[PDB]
Design a protein around this ligand. Sequence first.
Ligand SMILES: *[C@]1(=O)[C]N(C(=O)[C]C2=[C][C]=[C]C(C3=[C][C]=[C][C]=N3)=[C]2)[C][C][C][C]1[N]C(=O)[C]([C][C]([C])[C])[N]C(=O)C1=[C]C2=C([C]=[C]C(O[C][C]N3[C][C]O[C][C]3)=[C]2)O1
Length: 215
Amino acid sequence: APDSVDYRKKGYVTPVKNQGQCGSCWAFSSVGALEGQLKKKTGKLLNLSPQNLVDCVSENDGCGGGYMTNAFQYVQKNRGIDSEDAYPYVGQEESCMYNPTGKAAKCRGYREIPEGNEKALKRAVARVGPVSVAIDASLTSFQFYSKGVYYDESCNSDNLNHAVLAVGYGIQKGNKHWIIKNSWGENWGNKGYILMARNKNNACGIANLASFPKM
Ligand SMILES: *[C@]1(=O)[C]N(C(=O)[C]C2=[C][C]=[C]C(C3=[C][C]=[C][C]=N3)=[C]2)[C][C][C][C]1[N]C(=O)[C]([C][C]([C])[C])[N]C(=O)C1=[C]C2=C([C]=[C]C(O[C][C]N3[C][C]O[C][C]3)=[C]2)O1
């Protein structure tokens, strides 16, 4: 078995979503990490509610942005997270309207990838499934990506600003990569995804704030 894997084939990832006019990339990165663990722990693939995290994770800033841990931690002490269907996405901070009857998953903590260790992140993705990662996506070469293994020597590992989802890793034209799932719609990048340089010195700081939830 070639040392590369795409959890999309395994059935661990749901369709690509679009956050609309909202800075909720942290909420989708989290959800997809949970969506992945849920399918591992129970064999079911469901769409979890990111609106849930936007409206209720007060450790974050709604559409103003946020981090994934604070999200996983909320699910923990909340004893659950609704599903997309129970808590639909409207693309705008509203009042928390969490419904326990909607609860479609939960988690007993999370684990961080050691900072800047692509080896670690590789193992994780391999042994756990979709991992949540943060990156530098402010560059225009990113925003207009469409094919091949991305890499811009102007990416700044210290300027993380986007929460995306590692869902695999492989090799294209001999170029090691990271299958990344974005939340800007299916018409962005390549059907919503984007291959990002792997082992090229932690490009855009891919493994600089990596994490996944414990279920
Ligand atoms: C993400 O959404 C990433 N960003 C975007 O994606 C912008 C965008 C939006 C819509 C469409 C498109 C697009 C682009 C190209 C083609 C098509 N469409 C793009 C940019 C910014 C917004 C958001 N970023 C984040 O959330 C970061 C992520 C992190 C680096 C992983 N985080 C933050 O911005 C952030 C985290 C915060 C914060 C403010 C306060 C915080 O602490 C609160 C602490 N306190 C609260 C009370 O309770 C106790 C704790 C944390 O900002």
